[PDB]
Ligand binder design. Structure first.
Ligand code: ZN
Ligand code: ZN
Ligand code: ZN
Ligand code: ZN
Lengths: 414, 413
């Protein structure tokens, strides 16, 4: 239970992270590699090539998810899968998502290095457009896989220029032939940086992820009337940016009113016509709500809808409000969680139970297969900023835990 | 009260409908930003009309276009009129272009009636008056009037980094004439009111006596982009939260100086503008106006104090620049009286009025006797594609412009 002779090559994994970090590297040392751009294509191509060199067979499904499979002893056994996303935010870091993909690749290579045959096949997956930034919402491709969304929904999500996921998959050559979903998975694990400050602040090397908080995302367009910034008398103006700005403040208030765990953000805003001497006549913006308790998240939802109506009524704005994304907080599989904890104890790593504050493809996999996650810390807990960072020690430790948690389940007899 | 010398209202209205085709939008407005190919097309068309009406044409270093109808005295200083042909992105069919085409109609009407003036008469197109694509407004007439150095006018940049100077060269309006320097005998600008007063009070003509002051600002808040989820709420430095609080503050400052205070945030750029990233940088603009310079200065102080307080509470870095300021200005009393007498000549109803917008005439007033003629606009709406005016209003303002110009252009040298 403490045999540590089977372990990852930490430098090989770290160097693979530094190598993929070049694809979309930014001057501040981060990654700008939006989903289904040519840069996303190059990271996929590169990793697929590495996986094939490590003896994997590769398939690509209709949402562009990439499955890199290492055969097991039992040909038709359900796989133990791991993986994450290769796409990033525009202000993305070198570790969000890509660590889980490359950690999976390192598990494959380490099984080869040690000559280990597993009972179940093992797979590493790249999930498409996990961030939900260029096309919204997040996690749609694993949502299709898990049966939450129909394929036609995933393919029709659009970017700000009207390009669909389906068009861009075809453009970069990842409009795959395999069905999206359907296959039974034996178990799933995703390795990820925490994206918050807890593990680092508490000197814990491993986060044993037990739950993932829920989220609700919205799109709101206020319509008022564009008019002259000068001789339009102040009381009769219908300023859509005044309305949107008041909702930005309301959204923050709603976050703070559900402390300590409420999260609330307006991250995206488009003003029309955006001319300095024209009262804005139309403003589009997003709302991001999260809480670990479904009832509290629903309370935040009701408070937003009520407050938005009040703000629009006071100014005289028309409101188009859509909740474009919702999933309830989810508990990960107890046996998977135990396997992650057991793997941390095997190596003597410090650990604590933790709730994921971000969404991950694993949150949707948990609906169809026994799933949990492995966290490592990140420096100052920052993510979605180009200074996102992790130490070599953390990177290696998380991959050792992933390796043994996966081994534990993939060696169960069929 | 002799009204035999009057404009051709149909010819002027038709000219407005023709130019409105250049940049026409689905909503029935005009999207013809300064120094685009569409701005070039409107300039080219109007210049060709002016030359066919017997004008000689010059272009100065800021791209201002001077279409000149000679007078009896070859070297007398001109009586000038004119406005801008560029529009807002949500522009109407009358803002600016009416004063240009009204000037052209004056020239054609002088030709129709065989009138020789003592002073030459000129119609002018002033470059980039709106200050939307390149900011601030009125920079080309400001250069002309000696308010801004030429190199400042030429170096104003759009959101893609293109300068006025390079776009002038690109559309062929980097002219050879010096910008400013010529003495002007008098100047008049015809313009729609852009507010509701003249229509609401059933007055055909606004005798513009003053133009209110303005201060424009650019502000960038810098915080820290971070995850919209697991970044703990109390430690966030959200630049859009800060900017949004300033939008509300700006509105409050405007309302604190009712009824004449004007305050607007019209432009904002969020970075990185991703829905699950706390905004780390936000650029936005502030537009302040008031007819009283001391009140406008109070608005400035309240903005600077409030911005600093908002930034200090969140933990944001602030770059704040006032990029534009001119004090309220009173137009020339004799020009104002000429406009009033022209209204009375035709029996038009009128009232004195203060311009709520800026116009090139505001800067011309610093170097020559200047005033303005207003006509109403429907529902007082401007900078919206539904901006509208009746044919009666358009014709009446041009008749007043014609005789106010004639009154000054026929003064012996
Ligand atoms: Zn991620
Ligand atoms: Zn992310
Ligand atoms: Zn104008
Ligand atoms: Zn205007």
């Amino acid at each position: 239970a403490l045999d540590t002779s089977i372990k990852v090559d930490g430098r090989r994994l770290w160097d693979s992270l530094m190598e993929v970090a070049k694809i979309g590297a930014t001057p501040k040392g981060g990654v700008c590699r939006l989903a289904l751009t040519d840069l996303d294509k190059a990271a996929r191509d590169l990793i697929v090539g590495w996986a094939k060199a490590a003896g994997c067979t590769v398939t690509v499904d209709t949402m562009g998810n990439v499955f890199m499979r290492r055969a097991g002893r039992v040909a038709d056994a359900a796989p133990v899968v791991t993986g994450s996303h290769a796409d990033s935010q525009p202000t993305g870091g070198r570790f969000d998502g890509i660590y889980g993909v490359l950690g999976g690749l390192e598990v494959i290579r380490s099984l080869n290095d040690h000559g280990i045959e597993t009972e179940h096949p093992v797979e590493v997956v790249i999930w498409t457009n996990e961030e939900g930034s260029r096309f919204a919402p997040a996690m749609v491709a694993s949502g299709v896989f898990a049966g939450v969304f129909p394929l036609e929904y995933g393919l029709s999500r659009k970017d700000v220029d009207g390009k669909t996921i389906g068009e861009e998959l075809a453009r970069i050559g990842y409009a795959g032939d395999a069905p999206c979903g359907g296959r039974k998975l034996h178990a799933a694990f995703e390795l990820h940086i925490e994206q918050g400050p807890i593990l680092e602040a508490e000197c814990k090397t491993i986060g044993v992820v037990t739950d993932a908080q829920g989220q609700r995302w919205y799109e709101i367009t206020f319509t008022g009337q564009e008019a002259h910034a000068g001789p339009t008398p102040m009381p009769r103006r219908r300023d859509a940016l005044l309305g949107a700005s008041r909702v930005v403040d309301l959204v923050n208030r709603i976050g703070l009113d559900h402390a300590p765990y409420g999260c609330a953000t307006v991250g995206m805003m488009q003003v029309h016509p955006n001319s300095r001497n024209v009262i804005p006549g139309r403003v589009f913006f997003t709302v991001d709500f999260r809480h670990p308790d479904d009832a509290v998240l629903a309370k935040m939802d009701a408070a937003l809808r009520d407050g938005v109506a009040r703000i629009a009524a006071d100014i005289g704005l028309d409101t188009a409000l859509e909740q474009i994304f919702y999933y309830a907080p989810i508990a990960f599989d107890s046996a998977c969680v135990a396997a992650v904890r057991a793997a941390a104890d095997r190596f003597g790593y410090s650990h604590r139970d933790i709730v994921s504050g971000a969404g991950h493809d694993a949150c949707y996999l948990a609906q169809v297969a026994p799933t949990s996650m492995v966290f490592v810390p990140c420096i100052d807990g920052i993510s979605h900023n180009e200074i996102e960072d992790a130490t070599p020690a953390w990177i290696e430790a998380g991959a050792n835990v992933l390796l043994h948690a996966m081994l534990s389940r993939a060696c169960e007899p069929v």
